[PDB]
Amino acid sequence: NMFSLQGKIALITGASYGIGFEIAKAYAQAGATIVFNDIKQELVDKGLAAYRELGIEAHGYVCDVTDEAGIQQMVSQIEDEVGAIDILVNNAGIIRRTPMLEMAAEDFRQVIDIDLNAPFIVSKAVLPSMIAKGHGKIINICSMMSELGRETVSAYAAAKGGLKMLTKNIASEFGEANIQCNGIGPGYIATPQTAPLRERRHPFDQFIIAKTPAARWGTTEDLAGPAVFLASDASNFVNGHILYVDGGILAYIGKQP
């Protein structure tokens, strides 16, 4: 009922694989029509194949999220071919891990441009049709780094701190037009790329368990409920809110000896 996404169209940026692709799966299972983009045709093609393998009829487009003219054209095409976008998930992103004193300004700027400026560009592009149709959701994928810092991730933390405030600002500016803009802030989600950090007692695995009241890594399934919730009519009075999905990390001082 209120948690259903039946009839709704969702654009999840960068959802050819990874967390975005998993959110798309959940959205599809909730009844949503799936639209996504990536920066090259090869990724879009492989993504579409992967969606087909799961029985999901997705719609994939090649576009750089930092390219405003391109994104505007993409949204127009989506409107022609699928329909007006009800839900935007700004998921596309990069991370760099570089000691700040060693990080080239060009690289800092790139992280900011993809992770902060691009969500503005894509939000701006989808908003007119959301406003016109009378309801819209914009969900920004934030981070623990929207709240806490760490050596080597200065650009990423700056971007994610910014993305948190862009969320609150979009909520503020467009709330009156029945737009709800919120964040999802994943904790440590176990993915194949970090499998060596969990090989059997691993120091890093221990660090994560000790930081986490839930005493485990998160999963992509852990993000499905929170993501569908924020995309659904069940959260229509949740606005400008960052929903952290972290097993309690941000609530806990940590497991001490």
- Give the residue numbers annotated as catalytic, written as ranges: 156
Q: Is residue 190 involved in binding its own copies (CB under 8 A)? A: no
Residue 37 near residue 86 (C-beta atoms within 8 A): no
Distance CA 220, CA 190 (A): 8
Does 126 interact with its own copies (rule: CB under 8 A)? Answer: no
> How many chain residues touch its own copies (CB under 8 A)?
95
- String of contacts with its own copies for each residue 221-240, x by CB under 8 A: -xxxxx-xx--xxxxxxxxx
Q: DSSP assignment of 91-116, as one string?
A: ---------GGG--HHHHHHHHIIII
Distance separating alpha carbons of residues 92 and 237, to the nearest angstrom: 26
Q: Which of 132, 175, 196, 198 binds its own copies (CB under 8 A)?
A: 175
Which of 128, 132, 196, 198 forms a contact with its own copies (CB under 8 A)?
A: 128
Our finding on whether 27 is near its own copies (CB under 8 A) is no
User: Does the protein bind its own copies through residue 145 (CB under 8 A)?
Assistant: yes
Lookup result for tokens 């701190």: 161
In whole angstroms, how close is the CB of 29 to its own copies at the nearest point? 8
Options 80, 101, 193, 200; binder of its own copies; rule CB under 8 A: 101
Nearest CA among 4, 14, 1, 7 for reference residue 140: 14
Question: Of 192-211, which residues contact its own copies (CB under 8 A)?
Answer: 203-204, 206-207, 211
Considering the rule CB under 8 A, would residue 169 count as an interface residue with its own copies?
yes
Q: How far is the CB of 240 from its own copies (least distance, A)?
A: 3
**Among candidate residues 143, 135, 48, the one with its CA nearest the CA of residue 91:** 143
Select the residue interacting with its own copies from 17, 150, 196, 198 (CB under 8 A): 150
Residues in a beta bridge with 186: 245
Q: What residues from 51 to 90 belong to the interface with its own copies (CB under 8 A)?
A: 68
Cα radius of gyration (the chain): 18
Find the shortest distance in angstroms from Cβ 45 to its own copies.
28
Beta bridge partners of 10: 34, 87
Nearest-10 crossing angle of helices 18-29, 221-231: 60
Rule CB under 8 A: is residue 176 a binding residue for its own copies?
A: yes
Helix (H, G, I), strand (E, B) or coil at 183: strand
Q: Could you tell me the smallest distance in angstroms from the CB atom of residue 48 to its own copies?
A: 26
